[PDB]
Amino acid sequence: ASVLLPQLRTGWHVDQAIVTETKRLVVIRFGRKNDRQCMIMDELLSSIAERVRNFAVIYLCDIDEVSDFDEMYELTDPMTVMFFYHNKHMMCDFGTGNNNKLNFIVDDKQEMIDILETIFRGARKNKGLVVSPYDYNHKR
């Protein structure tokens, strides 16, 4: 959702957000506003955000409007999300191979929450990688 989630205007802002959540985890969604997949992801995350609230936080990035972070993914640039804790990038190994970012839509709200939970746990442990409970290997 647009009204539900908080959205970011610039790269500096994004960086600040990433840094300044000490306690919570930070899911950024890097995506082009008017895309299907991105929209779907946002919708999913709207639901999740409220739930996960006390452990995670969700943010949005118009990737065309804020082009600072094409370092993150070598200009692959589909409509992705990324996970952050203590300003460290957090690495969520699915089947996909892109251990960096989930570049794909998941539909099970609960499933999404679970993966977020997992990554939070990993971050707390200190781990950089975390194996998702789920597999994926379909949604490349």
């Binding site: 779907i40 919708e43 200009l75």
Partner: protein, 34 residues
Amino acid sequence: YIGNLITRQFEDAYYDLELRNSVMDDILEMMPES
């Protein structure tokens, strides 16, 4: 493909969701109040 490579710095059931979003946006546009 080649073009894409060189230009490496420069550039079903979702329907309901889309509708929901779009309508919301329209509503927002209609009321840009305090």
